[PDB]
């Protein structure tokens, strides 16, 4: 909508909302990211700290699939398997624990953030954190490794 805009309310004025002294000239600061170490240094220092310079090692042919390891917390570990299993786990008499194949749902590591509800599990996760191990052992479960 061109009619809702500021351009329509600037018909009848003169400078069109770009100053009478400092006129709307073409590029009075240089084009793009110019003067980043010269006359736009203070903007870059105050708002983009670290912009200039190198750090760390160059890795030439980086493929993003070699370093693929999507993580799930213990906070939402039970949401991977149906709500029926968590119901059927507690009520039944045997003491059989349900299996949460974390790789089936599309995560390769189990991090240990949430309070894990006090009933056993067997977690077939590809990787584990040290806490995520301790939480499952504490509730009374298995940290089954898989590849």
């Amino acid at each position: 909508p061109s009619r809702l805009r500021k351009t329509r309310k600037l018909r009848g004025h003169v400078s069109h909302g770009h100053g009478r002294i400092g006129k709307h000239r073409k590029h009075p600061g240089g084009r793009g990211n110019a003067g980043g170490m010269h006359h736009h240094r203070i903007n870059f220092d105050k708002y983009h700290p670290g912009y200039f310079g190198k750090v760390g090692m160059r890795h030439y042919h980086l493929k993003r699939n070699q370093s693929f390891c999507p993580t799930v917390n213990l906070d939402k570990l039970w949401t991977l398997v149906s709500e029926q299993t968590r119901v059927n786990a507690a009520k039944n008499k045997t003491g059989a624990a349900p299996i949460i194949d974390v790789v089936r749902s599309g995560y390769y590591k189990v991090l240990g953030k949430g309070k894990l509800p006090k009933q056993p599990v067997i977690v077939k996760a590809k990787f584990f954190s040290r806490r995520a191990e301790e939480k499952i052992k504490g509730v009374g479960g298995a940290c089954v490794l898989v590849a």
Binding site: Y108, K126, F127, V144, L145, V146, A147
Partner: protein, 102 residues
């Protein structure tokens, strides 16, 4: 004392039973066949040697196969190639110590 299959370490990966498969016929290209050995052995007797081979030979006859190694590494191309050339120029030279004996 039972382990699990782990996705990282010295013996990583998923469980796979391996098929005893014959290596494909493209793999055996450049294998020295009975007949093509004879042809290169035949043309060697007809043609002779390249001047750089003959110069490298005369560096092996004075028994300097580093100054001969450093030579062929400039002449033929790489280190892997110049080493194989030194191995084979010494092999044709061993037969000249045989063929003159009797």
């Amino acid at each position: 004392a039972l382990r699990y299959p782990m996705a990282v370490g010295l013996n990583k990966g998923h469980k796979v039973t391996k098929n005893v498969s014959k290596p494909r016929h493209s793999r055996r290209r450049g294998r020295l066949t009975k007949h093509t050995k004879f042809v290169r052995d035949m043309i060697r007797e007809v043609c002779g040697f390249a001047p750089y081979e003959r110069r490298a030979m005369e560096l092996l006859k004075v028994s300097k196969d580093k100054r001969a190694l450093k030579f062929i590494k400039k002449r033929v191309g790489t280190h892997i190639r110049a080493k194989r050339k030194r191995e084979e120029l010494s092999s044709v030279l061993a037969a000249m110590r045989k063929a003159a004996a009797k």
